[PDB]
């Protein structure tokens, strides 16, 4: 039970009518109890935003919460992931976090899930009412975006609203952060705005081991080449970023490479940063995004106010700045599109020039797609790329053509990728 006054800071918004209230709103004195009991919410990620989100959700009237995180507690976490003490190092974040939370907040029912978000399938996600992110890789944001979309049920052309699972996403990176609110098949998805991301600084292979002019070049080498060419800890043994010894060996073999081309600037911290692609992080920014996102989860579950139309960006560096706007949902979008994609392509063109279209077009950017079609009344894998075995069995067909493999325009094209759980469909068009 709840002690006197425990939720007054919430009841104001559920028991009272308001001008800025969402239209479906209904002031009631039973709302809070209902929220507390039935509203199931899934929190993806439990570090930085994850910790902050669980606290925020718990104190906002949420009780039925699950958290998925495949990570282990580390020392560096401790400066911004307040649910972990040093005693808890080594344990699984997801576990320690529900532990702490369930303890600090009286009757919380935080359920931990120690695993990759990819071990679960629609069956599992279909059960939540709102899902909140706090991932730290773009791919995961991508993956869980498709998953939520695949759950969309179209009642013959028309969408069935009761199958839309709201997805709030957070992102942090130094004194900068942002949050989005997604309504699968209604609002812009993660794909629809995949371009708002920055470019990835890919050191040109040449300079890395030829024209090194920066301390990073004199590390990217000692990692991308010299280590493989001299297994320091037995052949086949991988470079373990979290191992203070491989860093030392890399830092050491970095000083030497730096010294060779007289490039000052090599240091342990810089070496640790290159080898692990570290992103400077403070607790402050995470408290902010996680705060915004929680307020949306609250809004979305209660109808106390109108949920953020699309996007929020935040910057702490020079004063305080935020910009909110309504990102557009692309009607062409590989993900969102309730229908296939029309691809202009002369039946003369080769495969590679259609594979790389998926691999290189900045609007659809996949890491390793694998197309397939229906040819002799049976689905043949034109090209798959996952298991080394099939790539070679299909690698030859990457020279053929559309009239070459039996591809007559008008037929769909199932494309699968690591990026998303669903199978993206297209429509061939010969020009």
């Amino acid at each position: 039970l709840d002690w006197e006054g425990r939720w007054n800071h919430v009841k104001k918004f559920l028991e009272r009518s308001g001008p800025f209230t969402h239209p479906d709103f209904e002031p009631s004195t039973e709302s809070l109890q209902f929220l507390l009991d039935t509203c199931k919410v899934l929190v993806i990620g439990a570090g930085g935003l994850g910790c902050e989100l669980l606290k925020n959700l718990a104190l906002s009237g949420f009780r039925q919460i699950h958290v998925i995180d495949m990570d282990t507690i580390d020392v560096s976490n401790l400066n911004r992931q307040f649910l972990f003490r040093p005693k808890d190092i080594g344990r699984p974040k997801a576990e320690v976090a529900a532990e702490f939370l369930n303890d600090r907040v009286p009757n919380c029912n935080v359920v931990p899930h120690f695993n990759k978000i990819q071990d679960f399938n629609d069956t599992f996600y279909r059960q939540f009412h709102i899902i909140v992110c706090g991932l730290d890789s773009i791919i995961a944001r991508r993956w869980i975006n498709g998953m939520l979309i695949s759950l969309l049920n179209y009642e013959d052309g028309v969408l069935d609203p009761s199958s839309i699972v709201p997805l709030i996403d957070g992102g942090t990176e130094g004194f900068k952060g942002n949050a989005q609110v997604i309504l699968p098949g209604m609002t812009a998805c993660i794909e629809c705005t995949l371009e708002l991301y920055p470019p990835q600084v890919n050191f040109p292979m040449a300079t890395i081991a030829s024209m090194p002019r920066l301390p990073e070049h004199c590390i990217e080498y000692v990692r991308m080449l010299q280590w493989p060419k001299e297994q320091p800890f037995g052949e086949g043994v991988p470079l373990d970023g979290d191992d203070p010894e491989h860093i030392q060996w890399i830092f050491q073999k970095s000083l030497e490479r730096a010294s060779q081309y007289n490039i000052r600037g090599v240091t342990y911290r810089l070496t640790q940063g290159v080898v692990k692609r570290i992103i400077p992080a403070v607790a402050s920014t995470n408290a902010v995004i996680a705060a915004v996102c929680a307020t949306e989860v609250f809004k979305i579950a209660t109808s106390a106010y109108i949920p953020l139309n699309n996007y929020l960006v935040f910057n702490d560096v020079d004063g305080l700045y935020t910009y909110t706007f309504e990102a557009e949902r692309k009607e062409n979008c590989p993900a969102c599109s309730q229908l296939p994609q029309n691809i202009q392509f002369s039946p003369s063109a080769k495969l590679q020039e259609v594979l790389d279209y998926l691999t290189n077009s900045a609007s659809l950017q996949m890491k390793s797609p694998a197309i397939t079609a229906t040819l002799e009344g049976k689905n043949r894998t034109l090209y798959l790329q996952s298991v080394t075995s099939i790539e070679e069995r299909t690698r030859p067909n990457l020279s053929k053509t559309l009239k070459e493999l039996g591809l007559v325009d008008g037929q769909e094209l199932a494309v699968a990728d690591v990026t998303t759980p669903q199978t993206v469909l297209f429509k061939l068009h010969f020009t």
């Binding site: 990620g45 570090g47 930085g48 935003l49 994850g50 992110c133 706090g134 991932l135 730290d136 890789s137 773009i138 957070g170 992102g171 942090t172 990176e173 130094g174 900068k176 952060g177 942002n178 705005t193 371009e195 708002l196 991301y197 920055p198 470019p199 992103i279 992080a281 995470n286 995004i289 699309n310 996007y311 960006v313 910057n315 560096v317 020079d318 004063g319 700045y321 910009y323 706007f325 309504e326 990102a327 557009e328």
Partner: protein, 77 residues
Amino acid sequence: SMLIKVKTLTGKEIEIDIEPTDKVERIKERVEEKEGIPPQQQRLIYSGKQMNDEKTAADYKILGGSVLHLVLRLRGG
């Protein structure tokens, strides 16, 4: 030449000279010209549409008193 304003990711607003026919690809250079922000990381937005730097200011119906915002997304968490 119609004069438009664009906002830094800190709120700082700068004025730029753009004529209805100059690509978005150029506006970004005008901004870098004045602010030192590499065009390769600028995300412009007008009316919520993220201005594709291949089309042109006219395409996005940009006019005299038009404010654009530089946005961004983040990976960490």
